[PDB]
CSV table of C-alpha atoms and ligand atoms in Angstrom, one decimal:
chain,number,residue,atom,x,y,z
A,15,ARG,CA,0.0,0.0,0.0
A,16,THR,CA,1.7,3.2,-1.3
A,17,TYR,CA,0.4,6.6,-0.2
A,18,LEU,CA,-0.3,9.4,-2.7
A,19,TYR,CA,-1.6,11.8,-0.1
A,20,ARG,CA,-1.8,12.1,3.7
A,21,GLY,CA,-4.3,14.7,4.9
A,22,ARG,CA,-6.4,15.9,7.8
A,23,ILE,CA,-9.4,13.5,7.7
A,24,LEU,CA,-8.1,11.1,5.1
A,25,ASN,CA,-5.2,9.5,3.2
A,26,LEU,CA,-5.2,8.4,-0.4
A,27,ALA,CA,-3.4,5.2,-1.1
A,28,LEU,CA,-2.9,2.5,-3.8
A,29,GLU,CA,-2.9,-1.2,-3.2
A,30,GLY,CA,-2.2,-2.9,-6.5
A,31,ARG,CA,-4.9,-1.6,-8.7
A,32,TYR,CA,-7.2,-0.6,-5.8
A,33,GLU,CA,-7.6,3.1,-4.9
A,34,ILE,CA,-8.1,3.3,-1.2
A,35,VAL,CA,-9.1,6.2,1.0
A,36,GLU,CA,-8.3,5.8,4.7
A,37,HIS,CA,-10.7,7.8,6.8
A,38,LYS,CA,-11.2,8.2,10.5
A,39,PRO,CA,-14.2,6.2,12.0
A,40,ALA,CA,-17.4,8.1,12.8
A,41,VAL,CA,-20.5,8.1,15.1
A,42,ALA,CA,-24.1,9.0,14.5
A,43,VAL,CA,-26.9,9.5,17.1
A,44,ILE,CA,-30.6,8.8,16.6
A,45,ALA,CA,-32.8,10.8,19.0
A,46,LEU,CA,-36.6,10.7,19.1
A,47,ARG,CA,-38.8,13.0,21.2
A,48,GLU,CA,-42.6,13.6,20.9
A,49,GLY,CA,-42.7,11.8,17.5
A,50,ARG,CA,-39.9,14.0,16.1
A,51,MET,CA,-36.4,12.9,15.2
A,52,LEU,CA,-33.5,15.2,15.7
A,53,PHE,CA,-32.1,15.8,12.2
A,54,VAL,CA,-29.3,18.2,11.3
A,55,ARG,CA,-28.2,20.0,8.2
A,56,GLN,CA,-25.0,21.8,7.3
A,57,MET,CA,-23.1,23.0,4.2
A,58,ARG,CA,-21.5,20.0,2.6
A,59,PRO,CA,-18.9,21.3,0.0
A,60,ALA,CA,-18.4,17.7,-1.3
A,61,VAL,CA,-21.9,17.4,-2.5
A,62,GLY,CA,-22.9,21.1,-3.0
A,63,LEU,CA,-26.0,20.8,-0.9
A,64,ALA,CA,-27.1,20.2,2.7
A,65,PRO,CA,-28.7,16.7,3.0
A,66,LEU,CA,-30.8,15.7,6.0
A,67,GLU,CA,-28.5,14.0,8.5
A,68,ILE,CA,-28.6,13.2,12.2
A,69,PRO,CA,-26.0,14.4,14.8
A,70,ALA,CA,-22.7,12.8,13.7
A,71,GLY,CA,-19.0,13.3,13.6
A,72,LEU,CA,-15.5,11.8,13.4
A,73,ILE,CA,-14.1,10.0,16.4
A,74,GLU,CA,-11.3,12.2,17.7
A,75,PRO,CA,-7.9,10.9,18.9
A,76,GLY,CA,-8.3,9.4,22.4
A,77,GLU,CA,-12.0,8.8,22.0
A,78,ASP,CA,-13.9,5.5,21.7
A,79,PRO,CA,-17.3,5.5,19.9
A,80,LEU,CA,-19.5,6.1,22.9
A,81,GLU,CA,-17.4,9.1,23.9
A,82,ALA,CA,-17.4,10.7,20.4
A,83,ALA,CA,-21.2,10.1,20.3
A,84,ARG,CA,-21.7,12.1,23.5
A,85,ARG,CA,-19.4,14.9,22.3
A,86,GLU,CA,-21.1,15.2,18.9
A,87,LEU,CA,-24.6,15.3,20.4
A,88,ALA,CA,-23.4,17.9,22.9
A,89,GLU,CA,-21.5,20.1,20.5
A,90,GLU,CA,-24.1,20.0,17.7
A,91,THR,CA,-27.3,20.2,19.8
A,92,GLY,CA,-26.1,21.1,23.3
A,93,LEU,CA,-27.8,17.9,24.5
A,94,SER,CA,-26.9,14.8,26.5
A,95,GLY,CA,-28.8,11.6,27.1
A,96,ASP,CA,-28.6,7.9,27.8
A,97,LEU,CA,-26.9,6.4,24.9
A,98,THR,CA,-27.3,2.8,23.6
A,99,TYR,CA,-25.0,1.3,21.0
A,100,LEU,CA,-27.2,0.0,18.1
A,101,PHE,CA,-24.9,-1.1,15.2
A,102,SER,CA,-22.1,-0.1,12.9
A,103,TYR,CA,-21.5,0.0,9.1
A,104,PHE,CA,-18.8,0.7,6.6
A,105,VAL,CA,-20.0,3.7,4.5
A,106,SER,CA,-18.5,2.5,1.3
A,107,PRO,CA,-16.2,-0.6,1.7
A,108,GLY,CA,-15.5,-0.5,-2.0
A,109,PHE,CA,-13.0,2.4,-1.6
A,110,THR,CA,-12.9,3.7,2.0
A,111,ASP,CA,-12.5,2.2,5.5
A,112,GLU,CA,-14.7,4.8,7.2
A,113,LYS,CA,-16.8,2.9,9.7
A,114,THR,CA,-19.8,4.5,11.4
A,115,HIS,CA,-21.1,3.6,14.9
A,116,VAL,CA,-24.8,4.4,15.5
A,117,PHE,CA,-26.3,5.1,19.0
A,118,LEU,CA,-29.7,5.7,20.3
A,119,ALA,CA,-30.2,8.7,22.7
A,120,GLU,CA,-33.0,8.7,25.2
A,121,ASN,CA,-33.9,10.9,28.2
A,122,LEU,CA,-32.5,14.0,26.5
A,123,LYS,CA,-31.3,16.8,28.7
A,124,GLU,CA,-29.7,20.2,28.3
A,125,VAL,CA,-25.9,19.9,28.7
A,126,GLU,CA,-25.9,23.3,30.4
A,127,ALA,CA,-28.0,26.2,31.7
A,128,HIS,CA,-27.9,28.0,28.3
A,129,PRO,CA,-26.5,25.6,25.6
A,130,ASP,CA,-23.9,27.1,23.2
A,131,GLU,CA,-25.4,26.9,19.7
A,132,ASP,CA,-23.3,25.6,16.8
A,133,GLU,CA,-23.4,28.2,14.0
A,134,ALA,CA,-22.4,25.7,11.3
A,135,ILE,CA,-25.2,23.3,12.0
A,136,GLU,CA,-29.0,23.6,11.5
A,137,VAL,CA,-31.1,21.6,14.0
A,138,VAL,CA,-34.2,20.1,12.3
A,139,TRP,CA,-36.6,18.2,14.5
A,140,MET,CA,-38.9,16.4,12.1
A,141,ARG,CA,-41.3,13.5,12.0
A,142,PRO,CA,-39.4,10.6,10.4
A,143,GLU,CA,-42.5,10.0,8.3
A,144,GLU,CA,-42.3,13.5,6.9
A,145,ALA,CA,-38.6,13.2,6.1
A,146,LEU,CA,-39.1,10.0,4.2
A,147,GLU,CA,-42.3,11.4,2.5
A,148,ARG,CA,-40.5,14.5,1.3
A,149,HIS,CA,-37.4,12.6,0.2
A,150,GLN,CA,-39.7,10.4,-1.8
A,151,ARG,CA,-40.9,13.4,-3.7
A,152,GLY,CA,-37.4,14.6,-4.3
A,153,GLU,CA,-37.8,17.6,-2.0
A,154,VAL,CA,-34.9,16.6,0.3
A,155,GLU,CA,-31.7,14.5,0.2
A,156,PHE,CA,-30.5,12.0,2.7
A,157,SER,CA,-27.0,11.2,4.1
A,158,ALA,CA,-26.5,7.6,5.1
A,159,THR,CA,-26.9,8.5,8.7
A,160,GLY,CA,-30.1,10.3,8.1
A,161,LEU,CA,-31.6,7.4,6.1
A,162,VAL,CA,-30.4,4.9,8.7
A,163,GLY,CA,-32.1,7.0,11.4
A,164,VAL,CA,-35.3,7.1,9.5
A,165,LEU,CA,-35.4,3.4,8.7
A,166,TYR,CA,-34.4,2.5,12.3
A,167,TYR,CA,-37.3,4.5,13.5
A,168,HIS,CA,-39.9,2.9,11.3
A,169,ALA,CA,-38.6,-0.6,12.2
A,170,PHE,CA,-38.3,-0.3,16.0
A,171,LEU,CA,-39.5,3.0,17.5
A,172,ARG,CA,-43.1,3.5,16.3
A,173,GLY,CA,-46.0,3.2,18.7
B,14,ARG,CA,-11.4,23.1,-6.6
B,15,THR,CA,-7.9,21.8,-7.5
B,16,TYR,CA,-7.2,18.2,-8.2
B,17,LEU,CA,-4.4,16.1,-6.6
B,18,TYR,CA,-5.4,12.9,-8.3
B,19,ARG,CA,-7.7,11.7,-11.1
B,20,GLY,CA,-8.3,7.9,-10.9
B,21,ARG,CA,-10.5,5.1,-12.1
B,22,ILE,CA,-13.4,5.3,-9.6
B,23,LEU,CA,-12.5,8.5,-7.9
B,24,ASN,CA,-10.6,11.9,-7.9
B,25,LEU,CA,-9.0,13.6,-5.0
B,26,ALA,CA,-9.5,17.3,-4.9
B,27,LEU,CA,-9.1,20.3,-2.5
B,28,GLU,CA,-11.6,23.1,-2.1
B,29,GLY,CA,-10.1,25.6,0.3
B,30,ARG,CA,-9.3,23.5,3.4
B,31,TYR,CA,-11.8,20.8,2.4
B,32,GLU,CA,-10.5,17.5,1.1
B,33,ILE,CA,-13.0,16.2,-1.4
B,34,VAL,CA,-13.2,12.7,-3.0
B,35,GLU,CA,-15.3,12.6,-6.2
B,36,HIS,CA,-16.8,9.2,-6.7
B,37,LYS,CA,-19.2,7.7,-9.3
B,38,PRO,CA,-22.8,7.2,-8.0
B,39,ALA,CA,-23.9,3.7,-7.1
B,40,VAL,CA,-26.9,1.4,-6.8
B,41,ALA,CA,-28.1,-1.2,-4.3
B,42,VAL,CA,-30.8,-3.8,-4.6
B,43,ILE,CA,-32.9,-5.2,-1.8
B,44,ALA,CA,-34.4,-8.6,-2.6
B,45,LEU,CA,-36.5,-10.8,-0.3
B,46,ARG,CA,-37.7,-14.3,-1.0
B,47,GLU,CA,-39.1,-16.9,1.5
B,48,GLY,CA,-38.1,-14.8,4.5
B,49,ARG,CA,-34.5,-14.5,3.3
B,50,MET,CA,-32.7,-11.5,2.0
B,51,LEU,CA,-30.1,-11.8,-0.7
B,52,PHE,CA,-26.9,-10.6,0.8
B,53,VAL,CA,-23.5,-10.7,-0.9
B,54,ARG,CA,-19.9,-10.7,0.4
B,55,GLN,CA,-16.6,-10.0,-1.4
B,56,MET,CA,-13.0,-9.2,-0.7
B,57,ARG,CA,-12.8,-5.6,0.3
B,58,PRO,CA,-9.2,-4.5,0.3
B,59,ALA,CA,-10.1,-1.0,1.7
B,60,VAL,CA,-11.3,-2.6,5.0
B,61,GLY,CA,-9.5,-5.9,5.1
B,62,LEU,CA,-12.6,-8.0,5.5
B,63,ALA,CA,-15.8,-9.0,3.7
B,64,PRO,CA,-18.8,-7.2,5.2
B,65,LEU,CA,-22.4,-8.3,4.7
B,66,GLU,CA,-23.7,-6.3,1.7
B,67,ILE,CA,-26.6,-6.5,-0.8
B,68,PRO,CA,-26.1,-6.6,-4.6
B,69,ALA,CA,-24.6,-3.2,-5.5
B,70,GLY,CA,-22.3,-1.5,-7.9
B,71,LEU,CA,-21.2,1.7,-9.5
B,72,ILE,CA,-23.4,3.3,-12.2
B,73,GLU,CA,-21.5,2.8,-15.5
B,74,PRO,CA,-21.1,5.5,-18.2
B,75,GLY,CA,-24.4,5.6,-20.2
B,76,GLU,CA,-26.5,4.1,-17.4
B,77,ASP,CA,-29.2,5.6,-15.2
B,78,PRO,CA,-29.8,4.2,-11.7
B,79,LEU,CA,-32.5,1.7,-12.8
B,80,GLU,CA,-30.3,0.3,-15.6
B,81,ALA,CA,-27.3,-0.1,-13.3
B,82,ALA,CA,-29.5,-1.8,-10.7
B,83,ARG,CA,-30.6,-4.4,-13.3
B,84,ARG,CA,-27.1,-5.0,-14.4
B,85,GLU,CA,-25.6,-5.4,-11.0
B,86,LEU,CA,-28.3,-7.8,-9.9
B,87,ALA,CA,-27.9,-9.8,-13.1
B,88,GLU,CA,-24.1,-9.8,-13.0
B,89,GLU,CA,-23.7,-10.6,-9.3
B,90,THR,CA,-26.5,-13.1,-8.9
B,91,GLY,CA,-27.7,-13.9,-12.4
B,92,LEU,CA,-31.2,-12.7,-11.5
B,93,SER,CA,-33.7,-10.2,-12.9
B,94,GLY,CA,-36.9,-8.9,-11.3
B,95,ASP,CA,-39.4,-6.1,-11.1
B,96,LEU,CA,-37.5,-3.2,-9.6
B,97,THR,CA,-38.9,-0.3,-7.6
B,98,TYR,CA,-37.0,2.8,-6.7
B,99,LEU,CA,-37.1,3.3,-2.9
B,100,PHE,CA,-34.7,6.1,-2.0
B,101,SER,CA,-31.1,7.4,-2.2
B,102,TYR,CA,-28.4,8.6,0.2
B,103,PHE,CA,-25.0,10.2,0.2
B,104,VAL,CA,-22.6,7.6,1.8
B,105,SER,CA,-20.5,10.2,3.5
B,106,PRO,CA,-21.3,13.8,2.5
B,107,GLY,CA,-18.5,15.1,4.8
B,108,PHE,CA,-15.9,14.1,2.2
B,109,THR,CA,-17.3,12.3,-0.8
B,110,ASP,CA,-20.2,12.9,-3.3
B,111,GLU,CA,-20.9,9.2,-3.8
B,112,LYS,CA,-24.7,8.9,-3.9
B,113,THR,CA,-26.4,5.5,-3.7
B,114,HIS,CA,-29.8,4.7,-5.2
B,115,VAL,CA,-31.7,1.8,-3.6
B,116,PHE,CA,-34.2,-0.4,-5.3
B,117,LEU,CA,-36.5,-3.3,-4.3
B,118,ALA,CA,-36.5,-6.4,-6.5
B,119,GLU,CA,-39.6,-8.6,-6.7
B,120,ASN,CA,-40.7,-11.6,-8.8
B,121,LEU,CA,-37.1,-12.8,-9.1
B,122,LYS,CA,-36.3,-14.8,-12.2
B,123,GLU,CA,-33.2,-16.5,-13.7
B,124,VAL,CA,-31.7,-14.2,-16.3
B,125,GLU,CA,-30.8,-17.2,-18.4
B,126,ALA,CA,-31.0,-21.0,-18.7
B,127,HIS,CA,-27.8,-21.5,-16.6
B,128,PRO,CA,-26.7,-18.3,-14.9
B,129,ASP,CA,-23.0,-17.4,-15.2
B,130,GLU,CA,-21.7,-17.3,-11.6
B,131,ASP,CA,-19.6,-14.4,-10.4
B,132,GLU,CA,-16.3,-15.8,-8.9
B,133,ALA,CA,-15.5,-12.6,-6.9
B,134,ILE,CA,-18.9,-12.5,-5.1
B,135,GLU,CA,-20.4,-14.8,-2.5
B,136,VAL,CA,-24.2,-15.0,-2.5
B,137,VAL,CA,-25.6,-15.2,1.0
B,138,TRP,CA,-29.4,-15.6,1.3
B,139,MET,CA,-30.1,-15.0,5.0
B,140,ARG,CA,-33.0,-14.0,7.3
B,141,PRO,CA,-32.6,-10.2,7.9
B,142,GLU,CA,-33.3,-11.1,11.6
B,143,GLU,CA,-30.3,-13.3,11.7
B,144,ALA,CA,-28.0,-10.8,10.0
B,145,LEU,CA,-28.9,-8.2,12.6
B,146,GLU,CA,-28.7,-10.7,15.4
B,147,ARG,CA,-25.2,-11.8,14.5
B,148,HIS,CA,-24.0,-8.3,13.8
B,149,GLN,CA,-25.2,-7.4,17.3
B,150,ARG,CA,-22.9,-10.0,18.7
B,151,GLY,CA,-20.0,-8.8,16.7
B,152,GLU,CA,-20.0,-11.9,14.4
B,153,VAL,CA,-20.4,-10.0,11.1
B,154,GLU,CA,-19.9,-6.5,9.8
B,155,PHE,CA,-22.3,-4.4,7.7
B,156,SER,CA,-21.8,-2.2,4.7
B,157,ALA,CA,-24.2,0.8,4.5
B,158,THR,CA,-26.1,-1.1,1.8
B,159,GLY,CA,-26.4,-4.2,3.9
B,160,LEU,CA,-27.6,-2.3,7.0
B,161,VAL,CA,-30.1,-0.3,4.9
B,162,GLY,CA,-31.5,-3.5,3.5
B,163,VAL,CA,-31.9,-5.0,6.9
B,164,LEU,CA,-33.5,-2.0,8.4
B,165,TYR,CA,-35.8,-1.5,5.4
B,166,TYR,CA,-36.9,-5.1,5.8
B,167,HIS,CA,-37.8,-4.7,9.4
B,168,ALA,CA,-39.7,-1.4,8.7
B,169,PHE,CA,-41.7,-2.4,5.7
B,170,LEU,CA,-41.4,-6.0,4.6
B,171,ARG,CA,-42.3,-8.2,7.6
B,172,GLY,CA,-45.5,-10.2,7.7
C,4,APR,N1,-11.3,0.8,-5.3
C,4,APR,C1,-11.4,0.2,-6.5
C,4,APR,N2,-10.3,0.5,-7.5
C,4,APR,C2,-10.3,0.0,-8.8
C,4,APR,N3,-11.3,-0.9,-9.2
C,4,APR,C3,-12.3,-1.2,-8.3
C,4,APR,C4,-12.4,-0.7,-7.0
C,4,APR,N4,-13.6,-1.3,-6.4
C,4,APR,C5,-14.1,-2.1,-7.3
C,4,APR,N5,-13.4,-2.1,-8.5
C,4,APR,C6,-13.6,-2.9,-9.9
C,4,APR,O1,-14.9,-2.6,-10.4
C,4,APR,C7,-15.7,-3.9,-10.5
C,4,APR,C8,-16.9,-3.7,-9.7
C,4,APR,O2,-17.6,-2.5,-10.0
C,4,APR,P1,-18.9,-2.0,-9.2
C,4,APR,O3,-19.9,-2.3,-10.1
C,4,APR,O4,-18.7,-0.7,-9.0
C,4,APR,O5,-19.2,-2.8,-7.8
C,4,APR,P2,-18.4,-2.9,-6.4
C,4,APR,O6,-17.3,-2.0,-6.3
C,4,APR,O7,-17.8,-4.3,-6.2
C,4,APR,O8,-19.4,-2.6,-5.1
C,4,APR,C9,-20.1,-1.2,-5.3
C,4,APR,C10,-20.7,-0.5,-4.1
C,4,APR,O9,-20.6,-1.3,-2.8
C,4,APR,C11,-19.7,-0.6,-1.8
C,4,APR,O10,-18.5,-1.3,-1.7
C,4,APR,C12,-19.5,0.8,-2.4
C,4,APR,O11,-20.3,1.8,-1.6
C,4,APR,C13,-19.9,0.8,-3.9
C,4,APR,O12,-20.8,2.0,-4.2
C,4,APR,C14,-14.9,-5.0,-10.1
C,4,APR,O13,-14.8,-6.0,-11.1
C,4,APR,C15,-13.5,-4.4,-9.6
C,4,APR,O14,-12.5,-5.0,-10.4
C,5,APR,N1,-13.5,17.2,4.3
C,5,APR,C1,-13.1,17.9,5.3
C,5,APR,N2,-11.8,18.5,5.3
C,5,APR,C2,-11.3,19.2,6.4
C,5,APR,N3,-12.0,19.5,7.5
C,5,APR,C3,-13.3,18.9,7.6
C,5,APR,C4,-13.9,18.2,6.6
C,5,APR,N4,-15.2,17.8,6.9
C,5,APR,C5,-15.4,18.3,8.2
C,5,APR,N5,-14.3,19.0,8.6
C,5,APR,C6,-14.0,19.9,9.9
C,5,APR,O1,-14.2,19.1,11.1
C,5,APR,C7,-15.2,19.6,12.0
C,5,APR,C8,-16.3,18.6,12.1
C,5,APR,O2,-15.8,17.3,12.4
C,5,APR,P1,-16.7,16.0,12.6
C,5,APR,O3,-16.8,15.8,13.9
C,5,APR,O4,-16.0,15.0,12.0
C,5,APR,O5,-18.2,16.1,11.9
C,5,APR,P2,-18.7,16.4,10.4
C,5,APR,O6,-17.6,16.2,9.4
C,5,APR,O7,-19.3,17.7,10.2
C,5,APR,O8,-19.9,15.2,10.0
C,5,APR,C9,-19.3,13.8,10.2
C,5,APR,C10,-20.0,12.5,9.6
C,5,APR,O9,-21.2,13.0,8.7
C,5,APR,C11,-21.0,12.7,7.3
C,5,APR,O10,-20.8,13.9,6.6
C,5,APR,C12,-19.7,11.8,7.3
C,5,APR,O11,-20.0,10.4,7.0
C,5,APR,C13,-19.0,12.0,8.6
C,5,APR,O12,-18.5,10.6,9.1
C,5,APR,C14,-15.8,20.8,11.4
C,5,APR,O13,-15.6,21.9,12.3
C,5,APR,C15,-15.0,21.0,10.1
C,5,APR,O14,-14.2,22.3,10.1
C,6,GD,GD1,-20.6,16.8,13.0
C,7,GD,GD1,-17.9,17.8,15.3
C,8,GD,GD1,-21.9,27.1,27.6
C,9,GD,GD1,-46.7,15.3,5.0
C,10,GD,GD1,-20.8,-5.0,-7.2
C,11,GD,GD1,-20.2,-4.8,-10.9
C,12,GD,GD1,-24.7,-17.3,-19.7
C,13,GD,GD1,-30.3,-16.8,15.5
């Protein structure tokens, strides 16, 4: 495996004829409250639009999945909760090793008296049914984390 | 956006401080039959293991999503069926523009008298319940397509 580029959140390498992109692992948090799921949107230069996602981020040096999940939820929404590990997935094993760990957040609580808002992120509480409905009409795009959250909801959280 | 590398299935570029990986779009096919979902496994150099996935592939030049879906299902499993577009998602909008289009395949039929097997792929018909169960114990890994298929099943195909 020879490297062509070593960067901030990724390295580009070649293994034979295989182009490989090493990428830090990540976390995603599904949070439901009063029939609404906590989605987030932000400027995504790579795609040129802001898809519907759920709180998520890269695991930082020194962090395990659970810890990164707590930090991302706290930093992007100013919330904490009781987290439960659900499952993980490789975003695109055909070229990258980025692995995402998904958690469920319950009993949401303000991290502090007056949470410090994240300017780069837009918090969007929305019924998972609406997110899917709108996506089906081509009105909104999904990130893998957003779609996984929506599907997980329909499969195990309704009622 | 300046390019550092132009390759076969991806280009590495820089947009300001953002590292961007342009990648061809892809397709995935969820197929259920007799309580079993059609999963596939193959050597994935990027991750060093063979996660549980569903028939999937890159959209080739000249193809639209539906056509690529038909080809991948045919080439990886030797099957055809009535396809229905379900939804799409960006695998990791934080660094790549790879977008995946998911379809449902019903009324599966042999593409030909004696289907030509794909040596690089391992076809694994398995109950989605078992896939999830085993993954939960750390016995098998999931690709985004595999997890999406499993969750979709639990949300809309049981009964
Ligand atoms: N990183 C790579 N570099 C060069 N050639 C590759 C690579 N990955 C696959 N190939 C070649 O392309 C052919 C398969 O093409 P695809 O139709 O795109 O399917 P595949 O890559 O096997 O799986 C596609 C989808 O699953 C996930 O891994 C990923 O998200 C991707 O969108 C194979 O015969 C293989 O030789
Ligand atoms: N391509 C990039 N290049 C350089 N810096 C980046 C990039 N993407 C994000 N950043 C920087 O990192 C910080 C955010 O880090 P993360 O915690 O990793 O979260 P984010 O990248 O915003 O979303 C993470 C997850 O969602 C999906 O887009 C993707 O699958 C990723 O795993 C931001 O302040 C931003 O400046
Ligand atoms: Gd984030
Ligand atoms: Gd972050
Ligand atoms: Gd504060
Ligand atoms: Gd609606
Ligand atoms: Gd494939
Ligand atoms: Gd293929
Ligand atoms: Gd044949
Ligand atoms: Gd079992």
